[PDB]
Amino acid sequence: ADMEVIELNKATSGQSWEVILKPPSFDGVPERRRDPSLEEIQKKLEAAEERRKYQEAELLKHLAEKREHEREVIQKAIEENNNFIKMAKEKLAQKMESNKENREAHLAAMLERLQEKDKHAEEVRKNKELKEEASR
Amino acid sequence: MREIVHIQAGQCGNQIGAKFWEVISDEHGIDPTGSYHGDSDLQLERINVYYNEATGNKYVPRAILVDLEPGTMDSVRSGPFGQIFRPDNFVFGQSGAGNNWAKGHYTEGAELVDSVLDVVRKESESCDCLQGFQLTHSLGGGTGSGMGTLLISKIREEYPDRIMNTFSVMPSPKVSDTVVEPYNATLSVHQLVENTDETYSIDNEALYDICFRTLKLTTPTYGDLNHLVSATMSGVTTCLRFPGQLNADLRKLAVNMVPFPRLHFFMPGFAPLTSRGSQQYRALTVPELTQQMFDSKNMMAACDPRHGRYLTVATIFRGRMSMKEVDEQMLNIQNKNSSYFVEWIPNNVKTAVCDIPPRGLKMSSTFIGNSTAIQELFKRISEQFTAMFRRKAFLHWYTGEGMDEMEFTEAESNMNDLVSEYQQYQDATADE
């Protein structure tokens, strides 16, 4: 049964007013940060850019570490093949020289044996010389 | 975020890659000569994502074809859409990797790598706004695997701000082409965990099982398995290829799918499952399409999604259907199966509807899930690797290339940690 009507404004394409059903139970109206700074904003935007960039450079640092390891495995495979060649060359020369030595020694021993027989024979021949003519 | 640069490495990479290019060309109305002959402006709106426009009317795939073996390169040119590729974009060596990851990653692959980066820099510098890279390869061989991961690493160095996406095919004894696949896969996974943003885990075990069990093919061939791959590849790339709101670019997709950097291995799903020769078919309703999300039988990775929990899911519906029905069915699937969706990632299932169905079907559905159940795929590789490594079987082929046993131990350890991390999130509760 009660309403307070307060006319506010009237214009060409409008009219306004306030309707009050009940006043505030509590009287005495209610019961802030500047500004910000363009510099403060820039400092924070720049800090975020340096973080993005730091981590991008870190990721690149590890990819570069993968690249160095790659050249390292290529180098290991190259090094092992070179050592395989060097081992084989020396084991083979050792084998060819030991067998030359041995084959020469056998032929020397067997020629010495035949030459010893030759010495014994002229000696046998010499003893017949003390028998033949040197009698009758 | 316009252009994507596509790379095909090794036999598997080129076979699956060729199939992708022929499938999407038909979807965008491009004939093998590169000319547009379609009848929908929707086919050309986002053509620039995968194709460059050459002299006049012609469209040329932004694809780089790579192998250490010259053979596959002839096999591609000779293929259905073989003449569509840029001739200068074919980079092939003269001596294959011999199914050795070490040869692809450190020896022969390393020798061919700079020639590949030259072709990719040429394509990349022509871009107005390069999204990133899409690589198709297998993890079981030497080139796709070893050289493929070497490429990713070299690309990551030159283009660190771009998205690295892969279609990585996982080996299986059921359809194996080398005895050393467990080694090549473990060494590759290790690289993928560190250097890719998103990887579609395409498991040959899952593909074989679908062909044998579901499609009733007694003796499946690579052609049968690749028919499922091409369907999947077409489905997962739909949102990038056509106008839409959801996962419209590689970065937006990564942001929705990847909650933790190392957990970027997706379990793809597809419905309906069909055989190359299955030219029937007259079927599949919206509830029928939706039910398949939890259907382990439709997973392109040999993991049971009911054995884990979804961190995130992207669902793509293709054909003329009610979006209302789609939304209702998608909500019902999430409420009825709340135990397989982590509670700590609210609204983790995103749905998209493309009016254009793929050729053959009037209606289809593609699922892209980041599920903790993918740990099953890694455990299977790990056990196979261990069975061999324990005995140092075939190890002299890798050490012969200059590798140390420590790299094997490291790759194994990293993969075991990845498994351990998935298990950690599977067990995590929203007790918060």
Place this chain on the structure above:
Amino acid sequence: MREIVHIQAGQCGNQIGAKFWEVISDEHGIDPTGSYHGDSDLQLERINVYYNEATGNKYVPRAILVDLEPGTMDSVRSGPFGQIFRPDNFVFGQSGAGNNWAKGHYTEGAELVDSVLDVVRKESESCDCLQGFQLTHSLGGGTGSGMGTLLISKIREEYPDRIMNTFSVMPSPKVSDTVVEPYNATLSVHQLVENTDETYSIDNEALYDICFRTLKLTTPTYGDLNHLVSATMSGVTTCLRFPGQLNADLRKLAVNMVPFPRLHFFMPGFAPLTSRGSQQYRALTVPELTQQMFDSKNMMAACDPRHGRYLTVATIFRGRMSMKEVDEQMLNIQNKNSSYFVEWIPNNVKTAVCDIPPRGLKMSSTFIGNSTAIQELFKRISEQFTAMFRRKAFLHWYTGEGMDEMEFTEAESNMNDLVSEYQQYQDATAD
């Protein structure tokens, strides 16, 4: 490995050597003038092994003919194939050794030796690839024996890398009454043990026994005995003389036959046994050849192979026959008789088949065995030597030439060790 240089020393050496040259010339189609008149390219493929080619057409034996006695020379020139030999290759002394090994080895033989080396150096240096030497001689005489072994030693000194092969004929009281033969033989064996690579032990005791018992010849002559030698010599050299896979050269043969250096004395065997220039009609079957060639009655050394064990065996089949049959028969013989083959030398029996049979037979078989039973031949020479040496009988024949008793003692000891070594391998078990 093409050329072989052949040496003939003394009476026996020249008679057996002449017979060899006439037999092989007929096998290669060479007439007594040296001209080839055969009708098979197989006869000439390996003709360079024993012959030199001279002035067009003609083929000349790479043979050196030696004796301290001028007689045998005339006897050879006058023989069937006598005119085929190089005239300059005849080296003859004037004295003769008088059945004295010391005269042949240290005296008259030593004076003639350099003239022989002259002719052998000439033949050897003409060779593209010299295999080695083949010497025919007896061990019982003075020249073939003493000078023969002196030759081996001198040639070995100049050609140490070559194979030294001999056809050494062993003495027997049954054929020669010369009482000093065990001495000459023992002194020669001693030299052969140290200086040859391979020796074919041709025993006159075995030759006599075959002629008397098998051929029913009451009084066998050297012609009868030499007919078995020539058969054997033709058989054992077939693999050197014609294209083939097995023991095609002297070194390859030595490598297959000789497991221990000193054990290089072969027991040759032959089937069928025949008398001189006699027919014929009916040729042995493959099982007959396989059985007959392995019998004690078919051995050219007076030893029973069943009394020992084979270290190694080379078997040569000549004539048109099934290699399948030959292989089956050869396997059956070594499975049925496993106790006569040492278990510790696996696959020790090697077989060869030559399509060309020798003259007279349609089919033949030659056996070359390295058997521990050869110790029986050495024990027989040793017992004879001892019977004489114990009493110092005839020692002054040799001591007169400047020799000492010690050489006799040494030669004896060496031969007793050889016997003792064969016995050691006979008793050796695989386990």
Place this chain on the structure above:
Amino acid sequence: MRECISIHVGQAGVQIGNACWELYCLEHGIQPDGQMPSDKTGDDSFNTFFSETGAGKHVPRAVFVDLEPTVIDEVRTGTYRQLFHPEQLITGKEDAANNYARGHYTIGKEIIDLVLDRIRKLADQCTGLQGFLVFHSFGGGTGSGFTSLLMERLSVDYGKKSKLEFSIYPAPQVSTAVVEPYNSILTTHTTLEHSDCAFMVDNEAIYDICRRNLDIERPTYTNLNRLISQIVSSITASLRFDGALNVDLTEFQTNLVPYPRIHFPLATYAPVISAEKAYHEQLSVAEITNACFEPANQMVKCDPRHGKYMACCLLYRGDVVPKDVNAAIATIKTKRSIQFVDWCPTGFKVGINYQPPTVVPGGDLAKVQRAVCMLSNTTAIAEAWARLDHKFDLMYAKRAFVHWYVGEGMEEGEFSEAREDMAALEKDYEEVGVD
């Protein structure tokens, strides 16, 4: 003269701007080429939103910004390409990829000086600039990140100049990113001290009004935006016509904002009637006023019964009379509580704008003789912050997706700061309600 500059950020902000400016042109009789039969003989209030050129052309006092060109390219090629000068349509090449840190820290830095230069140029043409109206999404990387960057700078360049918002509150039905609660809390924290009055538009509330009142099975952005524009028009009508209430921007803050941080008024609109339906009897002033007190008509999903009013404004449009309005307010107080806080009088500030409600010809909305928008500052709006804060907490406890923000140069500490500020805001609404 009292000019207002409108700023549209990201896809949501741009697409809503399209709907708003299309509607303003219909309301002021401006054709899409910027021509208006200025052949009047009058009310020149439209000049607060449209400047005039030497060709007799009317150009919106607005700037459209996006970190990607797709959406704005449709404006430069569309029906209204001649309405805007190319210089006022700003685009980058790569978007903020649904990442607040990307839009604020990374990409934003590239285009900020350019946007401020254009704003400065539009402000240079103002004889009595009131301030800014900023339209953006809480959810996207541009709407969230770029907006907070812009608001901070506008406070530097235009110290103590009014800044009002029209913010799109995220709904899962239409959501494109799992990280939308993160971007929402990060933007709210950053913008809080820089905004004078923000009018949140909950996409689920709009989606449900379109579904229920407009019989649209699956509502599209075009459907949502036409509806949002009707409310934006109701709020901006006394600035663009010779009105009496909310006559200047300062009056929004005075009439609705008792404390600087509690600046989020709830909007309620009626009637929303389907165009494609049977001829019905026109709704009275009582029927439309009653509808202001129905939660189903709200622009944000919350329950005013679980709160207290601190300020109320009723903005009527069309064939409306004070007697009918006062009688309508009288009958409501009889049957309802309508609880105001201790320190505020229980009442209403009422405005009648005689300019009839306008609808887009061929749209989903029915043209009505009379309509009303209620602007009320209620403590119930805190329920919307709580729903967002809970989703944030669920993900943040696991650090899910955080690596995306950290990768762009943001610190984990920023997520905590933002959340603590939200906790304070929630506590502020609780404290303000008390007595």
Place this chain on the structure above:
Amino acid sequence: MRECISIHVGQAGVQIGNACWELYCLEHGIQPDGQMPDDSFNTFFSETGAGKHVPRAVFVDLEPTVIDEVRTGTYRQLFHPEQLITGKEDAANNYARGHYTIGKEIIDLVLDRIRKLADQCTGLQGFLVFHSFGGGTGSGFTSLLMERLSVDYGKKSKLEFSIYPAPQVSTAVVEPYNSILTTHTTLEHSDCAFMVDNEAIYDICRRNLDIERPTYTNLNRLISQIVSSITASLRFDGALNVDLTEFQTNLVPYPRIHFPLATYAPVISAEKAYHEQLSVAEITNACFEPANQMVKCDPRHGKYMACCLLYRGDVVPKDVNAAIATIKTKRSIQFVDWCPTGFKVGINYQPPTVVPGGDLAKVQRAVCMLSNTTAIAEAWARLDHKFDLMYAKRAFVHWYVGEGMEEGEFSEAREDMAALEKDYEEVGVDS
């Protein structure tokens, strides 16, 4: 461009090379003058300005006989004279002569010729070495060459085609010695060796091709066919290819365990005609049956560690995978536990070519399986036992010692064989 250099050592190596190169010419349509009216054949044949195709091969023998037949034969114009190398004197079935004494004289010459062939290679894969275990040249000279190739070419791939000795066709008693010495010496220098047991081939020729007494020509024609299957993946571009490196990687789990077993099917006689056409399943199944093996051993009592299937002719991947699926279901075919099973499949379009007038039938499809099974150790054990039997008595050792070799080399070689035997035993056990 992916070249492979073939080296043929001694008689066995040369004669197999003749059979191989004759067959390759038929397969690639190359006439015996090197003229021809794909492209991959260029890995095995270089081209001259006159349009002539010359094998990327060297033929070496210490004697000229065998290679002289090449220089006078049907394919005399196929090879340049410089790639056919011969000495004068063979190694006489003695490893020491092949390796040292005689070998040392021709080694630098052989390496110079291989250097010249390697100079014409833009992408050399490695070497294929064909030789016997038994001969003095095949054993000794090959070891010397292998060692020398490791010096000149380091780790560059070296694969062998080795003839494992059989008594039926054996020419020397010392073949087990030469086998063990060559295996010891070559072990660390070879990447993958494909052994061919002569008794297995002899029995396939007898039992399958109805040949009463098989000759080297018969054995060789069959061997060549297996060699052609192994090399076709390199000489043609088929459905599925495999290179030198891919062989090593799929067949060799440990460096010493490099001896795959080869099995070939089908081997059908030129008679019957009804005996086909055999299916992919029937031919695959035949690979796990012992009668078709190249080495006599029992896989049933061993474990597979790696399998490679080389198909040729009218063959399809679906037919092959279906056949492997059944092999995978067979409990009687055991794989080691440390293996994912592993099946390396190669498929080439060309049906197996036969020599006109040969013993083999024309087949529409054929397959060669390369399996690394622990059962191959049975072949080493058989050789090691024969070695032990002779070595316990030092039989024939004086032949090797005479050439400058020491008894220590024999012990080292045998100890290495004992270790290899132990290695196969260790690899077979589960962890």
